[model samples]
Target: QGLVPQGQTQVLQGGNKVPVVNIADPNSGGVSHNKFQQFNVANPGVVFNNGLTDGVSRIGGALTKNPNLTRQASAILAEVTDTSPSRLAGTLEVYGKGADLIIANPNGISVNGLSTLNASNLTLTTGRPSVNGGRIGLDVQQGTVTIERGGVNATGLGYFDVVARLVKLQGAVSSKQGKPLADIAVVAGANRYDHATRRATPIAAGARGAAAGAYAIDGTAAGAMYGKHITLVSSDSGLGVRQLGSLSSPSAITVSSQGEIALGDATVQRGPLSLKGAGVVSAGKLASGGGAVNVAG
Candidate 1:
């Protein structure tokens, strides 16, 4: 307990500094592993001093916070659990050639292929799931945000309690041929950050939204998310909304766009949709409430 550094400072989606749990120095070089081991047992999720580097820091095993399990740097770990939620202070950046930054939701959920996350666990949960200039958010230094593939979990299980101005998604997961593909949801319009609340507060409206709308779902695989405004654009290689759900099961999904929602030639199926689009509602679907129908705009 004494040896392991404590919590982390969480950087919000828009670069806002949100004071999270009590954080500790990530650098554990001079200190002994025994010190960190103690903390892992009682409470897990230890942050090692991994400073900014042009090089890629590959983490193979489930990074653990408990002494119950040993850590690994190999693919697919048996155990990678943590203490509720964890955070990292300062700039958490991953860039350059091998610069893709990856952190599984909740704690030590060490499986490469997307598995089922019942209400019992939340390994695939997160605040920021994409990489982009803005994706890194306010927690990042200056405006140093560059992310392309961002997503949120809860795609598989969970329901919307309220509504959002922009579009947001909880990414879905699928396993096939020993390989897994992640389904993505794209947000198209504008949303804002209200620091006073210390949350990504939804907005009624933002910029013109230009071409912003949102939605995506396939089979049982789905995504959990939140946003202000977003659009579902079509892609030939299955990029945007087309890239959703698992490999074969029919989806059970739900999505609601307050500021608005739209879908291109993307195929989506839904029943009693809760689309608001203060701007108007347009959609195709998720596996939760929608299913098995491919439609076009």
Candidate 2:
């Protein structure tokens, strides 16, 4: 029942081709709310057509006729209600014309296989979204998100953000260099996001069990992360942020945790590096090019 949604027929396409429905423009603000039962891109060449037709299948659509199909919305929010992990595999292409693509699923998210993210700004979270006070925000106090080794691409993106209770980034993430500052953030523990302010702050505490399962990142080979401004944090007081890879930026990089932070053999580059930890703060070769460095424990 969770696989097939209303007004859509399930096909034997060897993948969960759930139609992205309930799309609304919200009075010409260029925001599309694409609702789905299960948003699992499990096969190769799966296309998500960000359109306006009711209950239309977003996967495996013809691309030549609708080249600008993804340009219809400036902010696209794809929300899934299924209680299963959404897996991203194969060549899943989301064509958006400078639109921000946000995929929200409360169950969990897995980025595996040879998947690629083609968008301006990409945000993948296990947080539930809410709209109030004329602003959209996500309450990301729980859930887990894992990116396998060499599984996804984060190239040429304006902002790449991943927020969950446990964020395991084992893949290399990058953004366009020298073309304005692009941001990349991976956060753990309890968090909340304000869409209007474009900021994520800590909301609740007491994630001791979640912090104990700290599966952080991998830095060797294709595990390094690069961006203009990078922020990594564990919001809970008992949570820990461990960066096993290198993090490079052109402007600033802030890594914080209320419990412990382990910067294992990381070669942090750029300026204004801030590391704050309430318990223990561990680091490696840190360079700022004569920039300010702040470390508090």
Candidate 3:
């Protein structure tokens, strides 16, 4: 039962007007007979005779009365939620276990606070990862791994231990020019510094020098007793073998060169030698025991 407001009850005449039905009054004699309207005067009724009921009627009336009110309510709700202390959105700090994995959507994930993980193994695999600024990728230490680089530098620790199947140097092997050489090669298990000491060592005997005006041997030892070798040419214009000093012991040796072989006062031990291809071999007086020996036509 609900109270329904009727039409205006006031008459035009100025005389005393009959009391209006007092539709909202409970004591009105015009009490509704239907139980549905039992409480009519106390509770105001809303009449929508055309296809309207409780829920739909109330909502439709509210929307129709003020069209923009619904929009205003929505705006208010959004503003309140946006500024509320608990509703603010930004960086979120995660701590402790169960934070191991992070899942994200199309927007990706962002962390404002520091995240630390203490684990035995950490592996990262991805096609490409980008860093904007002041970002560090990967760093390793005290581990062995293959790295491709033009050169390598080792500053700390003891001598480098390199074990390779084959070691090859594609370029020339030389020290700083004019710098004192430590020791070239050790013979008889002894380290010798200069040619003077190297010559005093034992060498093969009966080794002869190459003839003058001959081609250099592409690959042939200058002497059998001596470990050094020389290349020769058909003309004496090619390089020649010049002994820097004398040998200590007499031994068999060979000096086969395609080019002329020029020998200074330096002694040649025993060894059969061949000098083919118009090459000449000669010896000259020693200059200060050890000096530069030249080869010319």
Candidate 4:
């Protein structure tokens, strides 16, 4: 019914970046949001009002959008709590970016129209007895997203890592999707140099004549995804991957669906696609290129 403004950035006592504006306490009657670039919530299943701030204005610029050139691990989070009822009588709309976000509610959540949640990373969980209806969508600006007890109803564009019990898609993801990090090398050793490649190799004390090591890149991963009961209902659409797992312990192709796999007419580039299902799969047409598809049904 009102606005709660959080200037710039705020901190979660839990030592992590929160997906939504962090509401320190639970609302018995309810609460509304006004200005929050990125905040955290200590409570779960909150019904949101209109006038949500979209991510484009909050995170700002390409630097924040694409923070690294390599893949990073997503942080596991605990669910925030509140007194909200399941299958809420209203809707929750959110926008902008945050760190790893996790939400859990036994009642479930609903949102208003024109409501949005454009975040960095997010996880939503509801009870099994009921599922959220009305309209809810997810568009991860970066990092990962996880949804349990239900499925995805909307499509998005952005290099996002996602995990859900059930899912749907209509987005474009690429191999080049990753964060941009700066690496530095420093050493006092005199013999840390490679003769042919002519590069410095930092080493421990007293280690002389140390040659730089060899390295190579078959590929890496930057993708869009869904988990569990898998299916591709989108036509001429896609979700993709650049690499499979780790190089030394590479998982080139993996499918984890426990049911029959499904594929639609959607154009999912394997370099454009790296599907990972954890349960029975369904029909989702795929275009496997140099990139592989992993399925278990």
Candidate 5:
């Protein structure tokens, strides 16, 4: 339901300046589909131009008049059809304004390579995306998304959403100082995300067979998170949500799981903190900054 690039691998010159090719340009031999109104790129090897000047200039120019541009939540869907996870090591900057940039790779997604996302919102999922009745949604039942290290920033963005069967944060996720990160959510297990409604609902059979002990948000390496509203949900049973990182939200913070919830050495500050678990609930340090704290097990 979009424009797909079917050309040979773009020969990119290797250097500090990674090749930033524009797949949204129809003149570049991309097949157009009118269903979803998106720019779909099948070449998972296309490295974005990481350089501020060159990278932003080339790709930004193409999006200005891109065919995928829509009045309602425009987007560029990068579909990874390989076994290896997509490694976004650099900045993906777009110019034609707002849209939720989505990367759907069934194998997995690694934001481990110091990736900096620049868009209205960024979504990393292991689900198939489709457009129905003008709404973009993900049909996710399995797969994983991991931020394996530090150096991931989505400053100035409204939302940073991750949808998959297993979600891991082994590093720090942040935004710029003074510009509070607005909203961030990480959901694990079989679920569907409606872009228009801005929500993810669990699938009835989505959590079946998912290992009970497998932690949805492995917080051992989840250094620190800064935002206004932060939510983490896991639909799997038995020890699903764990938090060891320092989380800061001025508005609210919610962590829910179908299994146990463990907040080990995790310090949450300045917000209304809500923790819900189906098995057990535990916490370390919680400073609510005059906000209400709720815990249910």
Candidate 6:
């Protein structure tokens, strides 16, 4: 007999009382099916009968096993999908081909730290992108883009080209020691592949004084400095002027045809200070000082 549940007090066979089959069974050949039935055999020498019947049968039982098995399986699937090794790596290359594009508008795309790009062709367009402390590395072919920056570092390979423009700093553009930070350097040069035009034109240094302050431009440095173009309407005060300490060059400060310079005081240090090009310089007096004219050069 098979294992049985409890509560049956006693069992009967061959018109005699017998103990329960929980101990043994006589259903097998020369084997005790249940120990409880073997001790009650009528003849000890006779072969013990091994046929025993079970009181209960096991049909369809409870179908559900552990309660959290479904939850554990779901968590495992999520972990597999979230793992980095399981993610797609070359999606950008697949999607970005030919003239295809990915446009990040409003808030622009930013790259932190150093990013190096080596490509046959590359292009970047931005309204205005600012860099705080990082550098951009690029190696390109037959293409161009505009970049506005406080500074840039570019060491190109092959046929490299760049068009750079800088924005002026606010708040006096000063150094950490509180002196003005003018004359910021702007440098450009040819890459190894550029054989023809190997040298870049030099731009003169800029002033470091406060924008509205009274400042002087050295006569020697005047050749390197030139004023930008602007409309000169009647409401416009006049040409910007700077006092010359002394004639640094024997040629006397020469102004280009592009702009004019007006001297506030009329003391002609050297023959009214020779003016070159189409530009002119005239003298005016203050409301209180006695006006006088002198020339030396």
Best by TM-score: 2
Residue-level lDDT tens digits of model 3 in 57-86: 221122112111111110000000011111
Descending-lDDT candidate ranking: 2, 5, 4, 1, 3, 6
Q: Against the hidden true structure, what lDDT does model 5 obtain?
A: 0.61
List per-prediction Cα lDDT, in the order shown.
0.24, 0.63, 0.19, 0.24, 0.61, 0.18
lDDT of 5 by residue, 1-297 (tens): 223333431223333333443334221222211222123222122332212222234332321232332222355456655455565555666443344577787667777534333456777888777754445778777688878674367686787888887877887777778774757788877778776676778775535525777687676646567766888888766747887877778778899988888875433455578899997888887768775888899
What is the full ranking by TM-score, best candidate first? 2, 5, 4, 1, 3, 6
Query: Once superposed on the true structure, which residue ranges of model 3 sit more than 4 Å away at CA?
Result: 1-237, 247-249, 268-277, 285-297
Q: After superposition, how far is residue 102 of candidate 1 from its true place, in Å?
A: 13
> What lDDT is obtained when candidate 6 is compared to the true structure?
0.18
Error of 1 at 142 (Å): 14
Weakest 10 consecutive residues of candidate 5 by summed lDDT? 26-35
Q: Cα deviation of 179 in candidate 5 (Å)? A: 2.2
Q: Please, what are the lDDT tens digits per residue for candidate 6 over residues 32-130?
A: 111111121121111111123212211211122222111111000000111011111111110001111111111111111111112111112111112
Local accuracy of candidate 2 as per-residue lDDT tens digits, 1-297: 232332221223333443222234432556656566777665553544444333323344433323334336666677776677777666545543335677788788887753334456778888788854246688886677877775455565677788777777777666545544458787766678866566778776344425343543223444567777888877776667777677777778888777777775433455688899877787777778766777788
Clashes of each: 66, 1, 40, 51, 0, 18
Q: What is residue 293's positional error in candidate 1, in angstroms?
A: 9.9
Q: Candidate 4: which stretches are off by over 4 Å?
A: 1-22, 25-98, 110-119, 127-254, 266-284, 291-297
Model 5 per-residue lDDT at 267: 33
Better of 4 and 5 by TM-score: 5
TM-score per candidate: 0.28, 0.78, 0.17, 0.30, 0.77, 0.15
Better lDDT candidate (1, 5): 5
Backbone clash total for model 2 is 1
Could you tell which candidate, 2 or 5, scores higher by TM-score? 2
Clashes of 3: 40
